[PDB]
Design an enzyme around this catalytic site. Structure first.
Site, PDB file in Angstrom:
ATOM      1  N   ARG A 185     -32.907   3.202 -90.092  1.00 10.99           N
ATOM      2  CA  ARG A 185     -33.980   2.686 -91.067  1.00 10.99           C
ATOM      3  C   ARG A 185     -34.727   1.668 -90.318  1.00 10.99           C
ATOM      4  O   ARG A 185     -35.276   0.783 -90.995  1.00 10.99           O
ATOM      5  CB  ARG A 185     -33.136   2.233 -92.140  1.00 10.99           C
ATOM      6  N   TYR A 238     -50.495 -12.028 -68.422  1.00 13.30           N
ATOM      7  CA  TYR A 238     -51.801 -11.690 -68.129  1.00 13.30           C
ATOM      8  C   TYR A 238     -52.457 -11.746 -69.526  1.00 13.30           C
ATOM      9  O   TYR A 238     -53.641 -12.133 -69.691  1.00 13.30           O
ATOM     10  CB  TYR A 238     -52.011 -10.664 -67.480  1.00 13.30           C
ATOM     11  CG  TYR A 238     -51.244 -10.385 -65.845  1.00 13.30           C
ATOM     12  CD1 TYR A 238     -52.075 -11.095 -64.844  1.00 13.30           C
ATOM     13  CD2 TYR A 238     -50.386  -9.867 -65.594  1.00 13.30           C
ATOM     14  CE1 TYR A 238     -51.672 -11.113 -63.721  1.00 13.30           C
ATOM     15  CE2 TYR A 238     -49.884  -9.665 -64.390  1.00 13.30           C
ATOM     16  CZ  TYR A 238     -50.593 -10.366 -63.383  1.00 13.30           C
ATOM     17  OH  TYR A 238     -50.095 -10.262 -61.913  1.00 13.30           O
ATOM     18  N   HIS A 291     -36.313 -10.981 -83.778  1.00 12.20           N
ATOM     19  CA  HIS A 291     -35.908 -10.025 -82.953  1.00 12.20           C
ATOM     20  C   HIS A 291     -35.170 -10.255 -81.895  1.00 12.20           C
ATOM     21  O   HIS A 291     -35.534 -10.889 -80.911  1.00 12.20           O
ATOM     22  CB  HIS A 291     -37.200  -9.487 -82.479  1.00 12.20           C
ATOM     23  CG  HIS A 291     -37.333  -7.853 -82.336  1.00 12.20           C
ATOM     24  ND1 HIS A 291     -37.345  -7.000 -83.242  1.00 12.20           N
ATOM     25  CD2 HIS A 291     -37.276  -7.226 -81.170  1.00 12.20           C
ATOM     26  CE1 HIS A 291     -37.500  -5.870 -82.880  1.00 12.20           C
ATOM     27  NE2 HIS A 291     -37.488  -5.848 -81.543  1.00 12.20           N
TER      28      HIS A 291
END
Ligand SMILES: COc1c(N2C[C@@H]3CCCN[C@@H]3C2)c(F)cc2c(=O)c(C(=O)O)cn(C3CC3)c12
Ligand SMILES: COc1c(N2C[C@@H]3CCCN[C@@H]3C2)c(F)cc2c(=O)c(C(=O)O)cn(C3CC3)c12
Lengths: 196, 435, 432, 199
Positions: free
Chosen positions: C24, C112, C68
């Site tokens: 999920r 970058y 996260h």
DNA sequence: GACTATGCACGTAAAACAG
DNA sequence: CTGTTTTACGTGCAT
DNA sequence: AGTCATTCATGACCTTGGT
DNA sequence: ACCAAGGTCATGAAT
């Protein structure tokens, strides 16, 4: 490792690292990312140099050998050591290349100026005495060939920037290049920074 | 126009120049932090790291986009370096999650390591707070960045090569140098008999170091070797700034080539000079002083760092002093104001605007703006001005400190007595044994 | 004690369970942001990114250590993904520095790229501000994180597979569905004749899509110039696929002798074999439970998803007013007796002593009393003598409206219209 | 790729990724180790599996073949799929290995509790659910997977083997090969969608 | 700073399957 | 040298 | 998530050097 | 195979 392409105007742009040579390969070749710091020619042995994929890959693309190649760095003082060497790498070997003077060292942008936050208002190679020609608006400062479409400001107008190299060299200058870069006895280098 | 043709006598002089002043990214005679360092110790500050262990990604990221254009792993990688207890004496950053063995251990990317500013770590960044060391500009031109953190712990000779020397010996000499300026290298080595390494053990070269301390040479260094007797009647001599990565196999190389390890004491002597189990050392005293790269020695280094604080302390003076002045003056003002709180609470009603109100405090007073400000910025709470008698007391409290601080300003002799008590202070708290 | 022996009938049932609810981490029927997404759009918010281009390292780092646990390049990598105009319709994040060619281009590490939240990007995160969508806890348990950003632009069907469909057609249907609830899939396709791809061109399958819009499974079709060169030769060349293998795939036809080089049947061969003219799997999570839906459900739940966003932004903003009109309502009164009040607040005693003592000569509440004491001698110039009076009606109007959105089912939708119309226009897209 | 070592008690700890197998190889408070950096056995072909360095390197270290190996994951639900497979990888092949039941699946810590900011006061719990209650005024943590645990700490699951581990497979039998061809490996999709009727 | 294998599903274009 | 089944290749988010 | 080459300097330990 | 020059390898912060 190359970037594709009839030698009508030569044409061979030498970028720094796959970010640049990636940003470049994505607006004006009539490309070959040089990865990391190249070897200091006068810093090792000929056998040495033949073992280095940076010397190798280079001389592969385009024949020449021992007996418009634009070279694109950044602004990084880190990015100089990569001008410094290559020229030595184009010099001690491949003399006539720049002896003819077909090689040129590209003139990247310094400080871009911005304005409208939705109307788009951009500008553009010396943020020193030059930058004054350009409150109320905004600015930037260019961190090296990468964070730059824009790329056609040094890309798709060749003469719009580049700088032709080597002109009226001669001798007594091979004196300094075995002094400055390459690999002296240390003594000389410590010494050239009397004008530093 | 493809303009501007130039001499390779030209361009290789001008480029190579830029790149050589990028070799003042080397340890300063004062901070002894080489910028890629200085900046990671400051960004871990500014962000407040005694608290919990903050990941890395965020930590390096934030170092890497405000104070350092260069690589990510170039940045952080260097940080790990400052995590390795067996690399420094005072580890100027503590992390957790596989720092890396002396046994050739690749440390894991930012994705795993959590870190945090370390005890002694505090020290150096211990007074950026005020207008101490002189701070410069960001590259983005966003924040500002400091040009050499002011420094409690003499990172410079306690950490171009300069080997560890132990807070213990360093602040000890540091002391001496102050109250006695002109000193001989022989009497000052009495305090720092030599460089302490995390893996000290044994270092030989008394006359070799002694000269080196002014000349800015070569010492010697021996292993932690053990003599004992095993069972059955056999020899048991085994091992407890080098590298255990190649000495592990280097032992077993002697055995592989049978050309001489708890299996003759002359025998240990062979390996003890050939097997790299007693190499070392060199010394190459070299930093940047006067924004200019120079070789120094035991006397210069302490010399400039004494001077470096002379001006840290002087700053923390001149500043904290001015902050007081500025306070005693609205205190000095508010006291007065008590006398006529009534009248004042008066025209500030019938006044007009905001900026209208302070001006109108040209009459029934002579207070200044900063005087007037808080008299109007007040809040109806404090109209309970209980400080009736207190504020009176402040006038002397804050006037004492403004008596001292300003006294540190002319008092050359009192000044050093500061830099002593402090340096002694670390000597003790973040003080180290010996090696 | 090496205790606790267990059945591989046991352990492989229990582990594999954990891992399957980690599926999920798939696009929700509402936000249509799959968490690794949701979280990068919020962390780029919270940190304030209309401003300048903020590097990446910092941006991903900050995503990567607050919302996260997982990889760095796993995080950012996915971000780049949202940068690719030729991947979405509204690119929900604009970057600069080699996004990456359709020509098989490796993008460069965090070291970058500089990026920033994008126009339409705004949209979705456009009301987290208040107690809109229901926010949950951090993993570190530090900050809190939102469980589905409330969303202006219908990312869900404008972006388990669900192909682009163009803000244009989407909010257009969106409109219809509202004022007409029960709708047939045939009359609603009138608004969204099909999915728009960034590289649209031509899509064939009218009856194939038509059925698919309720079935939530099916297969469409998609097609890739005719002109005459000099000297008398054929010149037919090319202008959600991938140009990485079609570049060589053209030249493969030539290599095996089986492109401005004259039979039009010839193009027909490549146009079905050379992958130069090469599905749909309507699947998300609704009711915190993974389901197949269709053109009616998706719009159905997203209508409902806003029903409750709007209701929130109501119930909240309303309560914030009430709370304001009440110290306004109070401070007005206080003007009447500024003198007396300015009185006992001197001779009072402490700080907490002062507000209490405003039990006499008033009946104000704490929040009433507060600002009466938190005031500053500036505002004792209480010029609002007559203004504050005016506020009592200014802020009482809005508390009249907002609370009216609370019972007014019909007025409610008229909101969600004017808004959705609003994006329809501003961040509105052509066609393809 | 191995980590060094007389089969007196077997001993072979299987970590996840070189960060773990790096943290472990340092914390060898208990090697009487090899980073696993795996293919779904019933998910491909035998020729398949022989081509995979993960199946290969595994069966290399320690002979066995077709005809105390502790396995250390994390807490990651990501970290399960790496329990899930290996067991299948220890099962469909190398049956007796766990048929004997010599293999065990290590019981990492969940939530570590802290306290003094200088006096050091640490703890441990392998269930931050009903367990954690046994442990305001102080501080807490939550463990993000076999790695952020220093090598020293690592001896909390390292240098006391039984202090954690969990012995596996006990009294398997059959009709369980039913579910393992259903759950993991690679069914026909239908079955898997179906086992999440108890999900 | 770009190599590299794999899972998780599900399509299908390219190899292997036989005589 | 067919037509079939089978096999590997591709794509985002993780390890 | 490791792999890999080189700059830049400076030193001690190994590879050639000759007959 | 001696004894000597040359050749390599390693270490931090960068590409
Ligand atoms: C292996 O070294 C690196 C290379 N290469 C050198 C190799 C040998 C020659 C052929 N090219 C490869 C690529 C590169 F291209 C970029 C970086 C880099 O960006 C970086 C960082 O600061 O983030 C750190 N490092 C290393 C210090 C860890 C980089
Ligand atoms: C090349 O994929 C990765 C590998 N490997 C797979 C390779 C093939 C098999 C043999 N091992 C190597 C190692 C790994 F070990 C770790 C990460 C990782 O951490 C990460 C991130 O979120 O930061 C992103 N990636 C990729 C998505 C960019 C990782």
């Amino acid at each position: 490792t190359p970037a594709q392409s009839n030698p009508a105007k030569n044409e061979l742009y030498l970028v720094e690292g796959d970010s640049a040579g990636g940003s470049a390969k994505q607006d004006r070749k009539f490309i070959l990312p040089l990865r990391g710091k190249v070897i200091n020619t006068a810093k090792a042995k000929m056998a040495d140099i033949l073992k280095n994929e940076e010397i190798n890959t280079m001389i592969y693309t385009i024949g020449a050998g021992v007996g418009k190649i634009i070279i694109m760095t950044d602004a990084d003082t880190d990015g100089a050591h990569i001008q410094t060497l290559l020229l030595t790498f184009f010099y001690r070997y491949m003399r006539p290349l720049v002896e003819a003077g077909h090689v040129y060292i590209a003139l990247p942008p310094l400080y871009k100026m911005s304005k409208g936050k939705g109307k788009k208002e951009e500008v553009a190679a010396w943020t020193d005495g030059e930058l004054e020609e350009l409150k109320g608006a905004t600015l930037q400062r260019y961190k090296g060939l990468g964070e730059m479409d824009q790329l056609w400001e040094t890309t798709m107008n060749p003469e719009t920037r580049t700088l032709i190299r080597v002109t009226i060299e001669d001798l007594a200058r091979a004196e300094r290049r075995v002094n400055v870069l390459m690999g002296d006895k240390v003594e000389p280098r410590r010494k050239w920074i009397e004008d530093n | 126009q493809n303009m501007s043709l130039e001499d390779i006598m030209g361009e290789r002089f001008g480029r190579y120049s830029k790149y050589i002043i990028q070799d003042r990214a080397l340890p300063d005679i004062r901070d002894g932090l080489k910028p890629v360092q200085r900046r990671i110790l400051y960004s871990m500050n500014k962000d407040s790291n005694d608290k919990s262990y903050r990941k890395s990604a965020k930590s390096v990221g934030n170092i890497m986009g405000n104070f350092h254009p260069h690589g990510d792993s170039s940045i952080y990688d260097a940080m790990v370096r400052m995590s390795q207890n067996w690399k420094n004496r005072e580890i100027l950053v503590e992390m957790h999650g596989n720092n890396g063995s002396m046994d050739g251990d690749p440390p894991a990317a930012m994705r795993y390591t959590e870190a945090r500013l370390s005890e002694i770590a505090g020290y150096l960044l211990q007074d950026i707070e005020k207008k101490t060391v002189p701070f410069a500009w960001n590259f983005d031109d966003t924040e500002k960045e400091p040009t050499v953190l002011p420094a409690a712990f003499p990172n410079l000779l306690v950490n171009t090569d300069i080997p560890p020397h132990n807070l213990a010996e360093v602040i000890d000499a540091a002391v001496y140098m102050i109250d006695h300026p002109t000193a001989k290298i022989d009497k000052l080595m009495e305090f720092l008999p030599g460089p302490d390494f995390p893996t000290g053990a044994i270092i030989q070269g008394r006359d070799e170091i002694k000269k080196a301390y002014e000349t800015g040479g070569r010492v010697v260094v021996r292993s932690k070797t053990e003599i004992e007797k095993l069972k059955g009647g056999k020899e048991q001599i085994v091992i407890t700034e080098i590298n255990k990565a190649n000495l592990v196999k280097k032992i077993d190389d002697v055995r592989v080539n049978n050309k001489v390890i708890e299996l003759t004491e002359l025998v240990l002597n062979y390996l003890f000079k050939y097997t790299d189990l007693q190499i070392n050392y060199n010394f190459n005293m070299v930093a940047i002083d006067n924004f200019t790269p120079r070789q120094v020695g035991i006397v210069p280094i302490l010399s400039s760092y004494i001077a470096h604080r002379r001006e840290v302390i002087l700053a923390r003076s001149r500043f904290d002093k001015e902050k007081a002045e500025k306070r005693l003056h609205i205190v000095e003002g508010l006291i007065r104001v008590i006398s006529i709180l009534d009248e004042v609470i008066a025209l500030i009603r019938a006044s007009e605007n905001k900026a209208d109100a302070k001006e109108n405090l040209k009459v029934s007073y002579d207070f200044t703006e900063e005087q007037a400000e808080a008299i109007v910025t007040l809040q109806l709470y404090r109209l309970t001005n209980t400080d009736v008698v207190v504020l009176q007391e402040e006038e002397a409290e804050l006037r004492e400190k403004i008596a001292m601080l300003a006294a540190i300003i002319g008092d050359e002799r009192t000044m050093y007595n500061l830099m002593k008590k402090e340096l002694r202070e670390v000597k003790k708290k973040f003080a180290t044994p010996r090696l």
